[PDB]
Amino acid sequence: GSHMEDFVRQCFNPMIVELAEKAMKEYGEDPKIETNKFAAICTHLEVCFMYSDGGSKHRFEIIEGRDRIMAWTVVNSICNTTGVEKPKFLPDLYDYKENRFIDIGVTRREVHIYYLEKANKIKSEKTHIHIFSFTGEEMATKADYTLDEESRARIKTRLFTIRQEMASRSLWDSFRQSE
Ligand SMILES: Cc1cn([C@H]2C[C@H](O)[C@@H](COP(=O)(O)O)O2)c(=O)[nH]c1=O
Numbered sequence: 450g451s452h453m454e455d456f457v458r459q460c461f462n463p464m465i466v467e468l469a470e471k472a473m474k475e476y477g478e479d480p481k482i483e484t485n486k487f488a489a490i491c492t493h494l495e496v497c498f499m500y501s502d503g504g505s506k507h508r509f510e511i512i513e514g515r516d517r518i519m520a521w522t523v524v525n526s527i528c529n530t531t532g533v534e535k536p537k538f539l540p541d542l543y544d545y546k547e548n549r550f551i552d553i554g555v556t557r558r559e560v561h562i563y564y565l566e567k568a569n570k571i572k573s574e575k576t577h578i579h580i581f582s583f584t585g586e587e588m589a590t591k592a593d594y595t596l597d598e599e600s601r602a603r604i605k606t607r608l609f610t611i612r613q614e615m616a617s618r619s620l621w622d623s624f625r626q627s628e
């Protein structure tokens with residue numbers, strides 16, 4: 450029974466916590482042992498939902514947060530109706546305005562490096578990438594950041610708050626060093 454586990458449960462809403470637990474169980478991991486991962490998944494989930502909330506109504510299809518089978522079903526529906534190429538890995542959102550898949554990343558390290566490591570790993574030229582860090586930096590494909598500055602600013606504010614809460618509990622160093 451770790452401090453990080455109870456921190457995560459008292460910091461994130463129950464809907465995110467439950468989706469994160471399901472994700473980890475589907476992968477096969479355990480929230481009680483792999484607790485920095487539990488925190489990372491919750492964080493990613495929240496950011497992806499804050500981000501979809503940044504557009505106009507119906508701008509984004511939300512892929513993140515669904516069961517893997519249903520996630521791919523929706524990806525295939527989008528592909529088969531917009532003629533866009535099918536990605537090799539599951540993205541997080543689809544942008545109906547710009548007609549592209551997006552993969553949002555959240556890193557405790559250098560944005561630059563996480564971006565690159567994401568580009569290669571994706572192996573899907575068409576998928577747009579947008580990285581945020583816990584220090585307030587962001588990096589987007591072709592410097593096209595999708596949302597307006599205010600919607601991104603609130604994401605960054607939220608990440609820095611998570612960082613502080615963790616640091617006040619002496620959990621940050623461990624979370625930072627475990628990426
Ligand atoms: C950075 C990081 C992400 N993740 C998770 C968050 C997401 O659920 C999933 C995809 O993350 P990404 O899109 O930020 O790469 O992997 C970890 O489990 N551990 C980590 O250290």
Ligand SMILES: [Mn+2]
Pocket residue numbers: 493541552553554
């Ligand atoms: Mn992502």
